[model samples]
Target chain A: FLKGLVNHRVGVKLKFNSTEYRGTLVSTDNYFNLQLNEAEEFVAGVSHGTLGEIFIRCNNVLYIRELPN
Target chain B: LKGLVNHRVGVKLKFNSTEYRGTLVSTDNYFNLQLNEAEEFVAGVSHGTLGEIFIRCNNVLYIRELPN
Candidate 1:
């Protein structure tokens, strides 16, 4: 299902963290490392800010879920 | 892990802590999970229902197979 998320928006949680990122899932490798475009950061559900494009290492990813839009 | 499919399981997420208890429906090499009749738990207390859910492998701290 994650591979199907290539062009969709998703919410990602990081390990050892309460912070989350919501954005378009631009790419993912076999290891599941992520690249998000137009990403926005949220802490405890409160918007922190936008981050344009970002890369998240596979080991740091806790989970990825589809977002509403 | 494949033996756990179609069984009830408890999933513990990393860090701040949250859990999901549900029927394990499917999984991949990464251990990314698809659950049916999924429910959320916080501090061991039932929070709400999620019906069906997909949990990414990296987010999981551990998964315990429940007694049949």
Candidate 2:
């Protein structure tokens, strides 16, 4: 039943949100859990180290859009 | 781009030497997308029937706004 919610064409542009991020889709478990890779920060004056590594839940998403490569 | 969650939209995806078009249902941080009525095209040839298809967000070619 939850399978219908995985891997959709919806993705948001991270750059548009004033945050730079780049990572690969590692894995997604039940409950929409997401894992990323090398998702670090490049912006100055921002200490993302506290965030410590890149890992975010689906609930933290603001939007999703197909990004052009 | 707000309220896109749970909203139905058109999606174009390419995977495993095949291209597909369908409606986006939902996605995750990895940009993995779940589409409805996904169609597969091989070598410019349309084959197979419609069904659900899972595609990594990175494989998406483009997406268009669908009129509701």
Candidate 3:
């Protein structure tokens, strides 16, 4: 087990209740957060003024897979 | 809202007894909401079945706009 492991690149997929998102692991602490990128089925779109930065999370995620680097 | 696939938004919910606010997450059809973090606790928190959650949408009280 490691505590406070810094700067490790890990593939992550965030699934919200409705949609799924994938991107690079950026930072994590009390809450698991990620710097999301465009992936299959997961397309980033422009903000609709009503919504701010668009990023999917586990709440919308149904499944997640990590790619081999 | 566009680009709101899996982002967190503050939500306000009012029911029979009380009103509550929390993070709102959308499921395929149902709304997956996180009422509060571990620290905050309330007795008999209001939760509806999947069907009920969906029915609540009828009123459209749950206004899901972008987070300012």
TM-score: model 2, chain A: 0.42
The digit string of per-residue lDDT tens for model 3 on B1-68 reads 22343444333232322233333434333334433321211333645322212223322223232335
Ranking by DockQ: 1, 3, 2
Best candidate according to DockQ: 1
Q: Which candidate would rank higher by TM-score, 1 or 2? A: 1
Any idea how many clashes model 1 has? 1
TM-score, chain B, model 1, is 0.92
Tens digit of lDDT per residue, candidate 2, span A1-69? 233323432232231233533344455655444555544443432435323335656444422332234
Instruction: Give lDDT: candidate 3, residue B27.
Output: 38
Which residue pairs collide in model 2, if any? A7-B32, A7-B33, A7-B34, A8-B32, A8-B33, A8-B34, A11-A64, A11-A65, A12-A64, A12-A65
Best by lDDT: 1
In order, what DockQ does each candidate have? 0.43, 0.05, 0.06
Order candidates by TM-score, high to low.
Answer: 1, 2, 3
How high is the CA lDDT of each candidate model?
0.81, 0.48, 0.32
Q: Candidate 1 residues A1-69, lDDT tens each?
A: 557778888888776557989899899876768899999999988999999899998777766667754
**Candidate 2 segments whose C-alpha is farther than 4 A from its true place:** A1-69, B1-10, B13-18, B42-45, B65-68
Query: For model 3, how does the per-residue alpha-carbon lDDT over A1-69 read when each residue is reduced to its tens digit?
Result: 111422333333323222233334333333232233332233343221222122333222333445445
Model 1 TM-score?
Answer: 0.76
